[PDB]
Amino acid sequence: HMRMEFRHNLPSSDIIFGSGTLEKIGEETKKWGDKAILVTGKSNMKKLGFLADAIDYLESAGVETVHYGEIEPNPTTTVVDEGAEIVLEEGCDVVVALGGGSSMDAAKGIAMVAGHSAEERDISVWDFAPEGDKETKPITEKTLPVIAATSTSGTGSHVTPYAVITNPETKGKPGFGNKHSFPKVSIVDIDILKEMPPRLTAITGYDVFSHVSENLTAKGDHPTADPLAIRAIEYVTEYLLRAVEDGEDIKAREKMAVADTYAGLSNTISGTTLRHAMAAPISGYYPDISHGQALASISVPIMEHNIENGDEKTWERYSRIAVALDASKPVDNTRQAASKAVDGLKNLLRSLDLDKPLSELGVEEEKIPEMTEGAFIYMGGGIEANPVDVSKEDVKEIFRKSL
Amino acid sequence: HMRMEFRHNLPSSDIIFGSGTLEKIGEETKKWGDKAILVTGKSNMKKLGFLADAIDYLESAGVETVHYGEIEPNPTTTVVDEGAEIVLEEGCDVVVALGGGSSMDAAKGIAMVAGHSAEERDISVWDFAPEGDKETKPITEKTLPVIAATSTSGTGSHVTPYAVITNPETKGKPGFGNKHSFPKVSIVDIDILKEMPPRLTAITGYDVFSHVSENLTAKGDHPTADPLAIRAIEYVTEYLLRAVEDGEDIKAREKMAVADTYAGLSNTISGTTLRHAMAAPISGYYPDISHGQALASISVPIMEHNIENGDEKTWERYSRIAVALDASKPVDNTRQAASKAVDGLKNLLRSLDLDKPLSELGVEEEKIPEMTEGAFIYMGGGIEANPVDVSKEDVKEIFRKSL
Ligand SMILES: NC(=O)C1=CN([C@@H]2O[C@H](COP(=O)(O)OP(=O)(O)OC[C@H]3O[C@@H](n4cnc5c(N)ncnc54)[C@H](OP(=O)(O)O)[C@@H]3O)[C@@H](O)[C@H]2O)C=CC1
Ligand SMILES: NC(=O)C1=CN([C@@H]2O[C@H](COP(=O)(O)OP(=O)(O)OC[C@H]3O[C@@H](n4cnc5c(N)ncnc54)[C@H](OP(=O)(O)O)[C@@H]3O)[C@@H](O)[C@H]2O)C=CC1
Ligand SMILES: [Mn+2]
Ligand SMILES: [Mn+2]
């Protein structure tokens, strides 16, 4: 018998879940600081009224608030570093996020820079970012505390340590974070999430499924993540399409928000693999491409490559995914049982209108070698976590099949 | 549709899992202090050699160590308070546990007292303990850091905040703890656990099942605990009897240790209910009765009372328990589907030789009113968490049926 070995690490988590829990954002933020920077996107929280409510709750709690409404999707180093300058200039002592993964990550990045800085700055978020064997800047308890109110049932970021930040000079899109950038308090408000439009619901929903399916197949044992990851896939298969077709189906929104929370906790304990490592350089080189659409367009080839080069332990993991996708009845540990995960995946992608080759997104074949370099330079951990080896030419070939 | 509302709170967790991970206890403990009190029982870790190894690893890591080998099962206030006096007298700055729930809880209690004390003491662990509406002493970050190496696949205590301490003057056996008494590092060593004898394996195994089955039926929503709790029941039904009948079946030991870890995390997020509230005063008044045997002997009547006074949401939870126990195929939300959990429970208890009326343990009918008082004075939270009301006379009647 093969013995089981692992180390589980999960930072403290405080999750306020329900509809109308945006109410709490002020009382909770005051516990951590008197002056917040409020990090958001440019239009939807404002248009939907939740920006005004957050500001109200924060001020009413006695938290003086500076609004930073500049996060565009796929946040950049420049936008983080400029928001950190504001934190230093205004004296903010806590970073509050109201938005999706792009806002929550930008917020964590701002907390990092501003917390480690001198008076005017002298450090960039990129100093914390992996890049080849570059020795990163340690991320320490100096990181400012982060309060995260998510608006998508998409990234898990309200309960992960990670920020995903793009450098436009290199096109890299790495993740980074640890226990000191995990949000102190996490607010999941169904009244905010249920306003996602159908397309956003489907994209962020697929992100949930992508996290947990990679978390389960990542190399080594990780049994504390696995039941959360499995249940999330069951919730995706049962509720995601319900949420897309009726945004006001509240049960379905609640299950996708629980599923998204599972995914963040599961992705903290375990980690993502090749699909994430390759989707980063796609949105890195093509910033108008949504993260989840990038994941979708390369999923089939990657799952097929991992199954073709796998072993019985990895095949059994893919067979549990197939079962959770309703693509099969019995779990088994063979190449063929595992291959049903590809059928269930295709079904999922079709029901969500996410099955698009990279061509239909605007990716061009000439970019392959650059994007392959991107994947190894900036997502080396995910390549290492993948259950089967890949060479630089494996990844080139995978990109071409996804075109 | 009934909206979903909850707050999830889980302290930081660091779990080192494998066989031979006792190796790590010194390096890990040194991160938190230079001088440990090592809290253990009186004979088995010593006899089995693990006491000598721990001391070796601690000293070899440069952690000067004072051994406190005085924890008897069902630890008392007196034993905690005397161990705290040693911590103060010797200057210890970190508390290390090597043992079962009794040692781990005693350790947490010692960390509490010694951390909040003046020079010689002036405070008892009982000051932190619930007791009616007595205003407890707040448990704060002054609590000393705790390193927990468990030796039973039984209590979850290596990953809960709680200490369960008996006051022999009152016979109360409450639990108490929060984020500041959650172990900083948790070591699960299969080489230690696989030495549990058959009877201890079965008793502590039933404790795992008791935690997660109450965690799942506790009042309100708690979806982040539920998948861990479910998987634990699946592991109990599939491996516990294997572990009892062959202590050297390592796969089975590993699954019960994962199940026990699930239970601790699940019991931190959610909570136990009436079965635990009533089993406390049994071991409180009869300290030679094992916690898990006490739980076993009152389970059938309690499950029947909760099912008889339940609703469809609680019935559905019991039906999932029945399915996880292999007592039934389809989950359903009726009184009858739920009642199959009682059949699966009876099967479990019989396969483990735990189905004994309280009489066969030495409990006497004359004690009922005292034990009922015990349950409300000292386990009020669990009564409140139970999915159906109970009066003081409900609990008296339940005790009599279990006799
Ligand atoms: N663990 C981590 O740190 C992870 C990070 N990521 C990263 O997360 C980002 C995720 O972005 P994601 O959350 O998917 O979406 P984004 O945060 O990037 O932006 C979402 C878009 O949808 C709009 N929007 C957001 N919420 C709502 C809503 N409730 N109703 C209407 N419109 C809304 C936003 O409006 P506006 O423009 O007004 O904000 C914005 O235009 C990516 O950069 C990805 O790399 C992905 C996975 C995990
Ligand atoms: N979250 C919490 O804080 C919880 C706490 N509890 C409490 O936990 C305690 C649990 O006790 P539990 O862990 O069940 O058992 P105990 O720690 O009470 O003692 C176990 C007995 O078995 C012996 N022993 C322990 N490990 C081994 C081993 N690996 N091989 C051989 N002998 C062994 C001990 O030897 P020795 O005498 O040498 O130590 C002792 O005699 C109870 O007081 C209960 O109330 C219960 C559930 C949850
Ligand atoms: Mn993702
Ligand atoms: Mn118990």
Automatic annotation (TrEMBL), chains A, B:
<feature type="binding site">
    <location>
        <position position="160"/>
    </location>
    <ligand>
        <name>NADPH</name>
    </ligand>
</feature>
<keyword id="KW-0479">Metal-binding</keyword>
<dbReference type="GO" id="GO:0000166">
    <property type="term" value="F:nucleotide binding"/>
</dbReference>
<feature type="binding site">
    <location>
        <position position="151"/>
    </location>
    <ligand>
        <name>NADPH</name>
    </ligand>
</feature>
<feature type="binding site">
    <location>
        <position position="42"/>
    </location>
    <ligand>
        <name>NADPH</name>
    </ligand>
</feature>
<dbReference type="InterPro" id="IPR018211">
    <property type="entry name" value="ADH_Fe_CS"/>
</dbReference>
<protein>
    <submittedName>
        <fullName>Uncharacterized protein</fullName>
    </submittedName>
</protein>
<feature type="binding site">
    <location>
        <position position="192"/>
    </location>
    <ligand>
        <name>NADPH</name>
    </ligand>
</feature>
<dbReference type="Pfam" id="PF25137">
    <property type="entry name" value="ADH_Fe_C"/>
</dbReference>
<feature type="binding site">
    <location>
        <position position="101"/>
    </location>
    <ligand>
        <name>NADPH</name>
    </ligand>
</feature>
<feature type="domain" description="Alcohol dehydrogenase iron-type/glycerol dehydrogenase GldA">
    <location>
        <begin position="13"/>
        <end position="189"/>
    </location>
</feature>
<dbReference type="Pfam" id="PF00465">
    <property type="entry name" value="Fe-ADH"/>
</dbReference>
<dbReference type="GO" id="GO:0004022">
    <property type="term" value="F:alcohol dehydrogenase (NAD+) activity"/>
</dbReference>
<feature type="binding site">
    <location>
        <position position="44"/>
    </location>
    <ligand>
        <name>NADPH</name>
    </ligand>
</feature>
<dbReference type="InterPro" id="IPR039697">
    <property type="entry name" value="Alcohol_dehydrogenase_Fe"/>
</dbReference>
<keyword id="KW-0560">Oxidoreductase</keyword>
<feature type="domain" description="Fe-containing alcohol dehydrogenase-like C-terminal">
    <location>
        <begin position="201"/>
        <end position="402"/>
    </location>
</feature>
<dbReference type="InterPro" id="IPR056798">
    <property type="entry name" value="ADH_Fe_C"/>
</dbReference>
<feature type="binding site">
    <location>
        <position position="291"/>
    </location>
    <ligand>
        <name>Mn(2+)</name>
    </ligand>
</feature>
<feature type="binding site">
    <location>
        <position position="173"/>
    </location>
    <ligand>
        <name>NADPH</name>
    </ligand>
</feature>
<feature type="binding site">
    <location>
        <position position="102"/>
    </location>
    <ligand>
        <name>NADPH</name>
    </ligand>
</feature>
<dbReference type="GO" id="GO:0046872">
    <property type="term" value="F:metal ion binding"/>
</dbReference>
<feature type="binding site">
    <location>
        <position position="207"/>
    </location>
    <ligand>
        <name>Mn(2+)</name>
    </ligand>
</feature>
<feature type="binding site">
    <location>
        <position position="276"/>
    </location>
    <ligand>
        <name>Mn(2+)</name>
    </ligand>
</feature>
<dbReference type="InterPro" id="IPR001670">
    <property type="entry name" value="ADH_Fe/GldA"/>
</dbReference>
<keyword id="KW-0547">Nucleotide-binding</keyword>
<feature type="binding site">
    <location>
        <position position="74"/>
    </location>
    <ligand>
        <name>NADPH</name>
    </ligand>
</feature>
<feature type="binding site">
    <location>
        <position position="211"/>
    </location>
    <ligand>
        <name>Mn(2+)</name>
    </ligand>
</feature>
<feature type="binding site">
    <location>
        <position position="43"/>
    </location>
    <ligand>
        <name>NADPH</name>
    </ligand>
</feature>
<feature type="binding site">
    <location>
        <position position="152"/>
    </location>
    <ligand>
        <name>NADPH</name>
    </ligand>
</feature>
